[PDB]
Amino acid sequence: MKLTDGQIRINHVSSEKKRRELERAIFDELVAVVPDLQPQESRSELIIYLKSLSYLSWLYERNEKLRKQIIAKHE
Amino acid sequence: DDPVKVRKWKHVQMEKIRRINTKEAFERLIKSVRTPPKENGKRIPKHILLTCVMNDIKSIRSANEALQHILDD
DNA sequence: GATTTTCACATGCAG
DNA sequence: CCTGCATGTGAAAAT
């Protein structure tokens, strides 16, 4: 049967709420795994994204540095 | 004049500017992340993209640890 | 078609 | 007072 206005409205609210709760959980995972990202920053999207990108860049840089060191230990 | 309405206006626009700057930071982040190919030309929701971020972080940490053990052998 | 999901928005309010 | 984050909702994209 056709959903009533009230049923449509709260389905809308809950769908939004669940997705925000989903995003926030990932924010908390990023706080946990990004050294320089602090729990106080766990709901500041701009800072999460910038510090995550910085961490990615450093991780790739480290990867380069190690590969060269192996290529060096084999001379 | 009405400083109250000006302050209301400024807060509205500065929220929209915060959203713009947040979106720019997000797009910069996502351009450096292995993301799924757009099947059927359908947008990828932010939270799916965020999972790709977490995956890439974990994936490269591991690779680096594996590289570290090789360097210690 | 109707419903779900997502994005963007204007606003309330803690600190 | 200011701002940064939280909320439900309009409109649009996806299902």
Residue numbers in the entry:
A (entry chain A): 1 to 75
B (entry chain B): 2 to 74
Q: What text comes from the article?
A:
Previous research has demonstrated that Ino2p/Ino4p heterodimer is associated with the transcriptional regulation of phospholipid biosynthetic genes. In Saccharomyces cerevisiae, limiting the extracellular level of inositol and choline (IC) leads to the formation of an Ino2p/Ino4p heterodimeric complex, both in vivo and in vitro. These genes possess at least one copy of the designated inositol/choline-responsive element (ICRE), the consensus sequence (WYTTCAYRTG), or conserved UASINO in their promoter sequence, and they are regulated by their corresponding trans-acting bHLH factors.
The crystal belongs to the space group P3121 and contains a single copy of Ino2pDBD/Ino4pDBD-heterodimer-bound promoter DNA (Ino2pDBD/Ino4pDBD/DNA) in the asymmetric unit. The overall structure of the Ino2pDBD/Ino4pDBD/DNA ternary complex reflected that the heterodimer adopts an X-shaped structure while the duplex DNA exhibits the B-type of DNA conformation. Each protein in the heterodimer is comprised of two helices (H1 and H2) separated by a loop, as illustrated in Figure 2. Similarly, the residues in Ino4p include Helix (H1′: Met1′-Val33′), Loop (L’: Val34′-Ser44′), and Helix (H2′: Glu45′-Glu75′). It is note-worthy that the structure reflects the fact that the α-helices (H1 and H1′) of both proteins are symmetrically positioned in the major groove of the promoter DNA. The molecular interaction of protein and DNA might be an important characteristic of transcription factors in regulating various cellular processes, such as gene expression and DNA replication and repair mechanisms. The crystalline structure of the Ino2pDBD/Ino4pDBD/DNA ternary complex indicates that the main interprotein–promoter DNA mutual interactions are mediated by several residues in the first helices (Ino2pH1 and Ino4pH1′), as illustrated in Figure 3A. In order to investigate whether these conserved residues affect the protein–DNA mutual interaction, these residues were mutated to alanine.
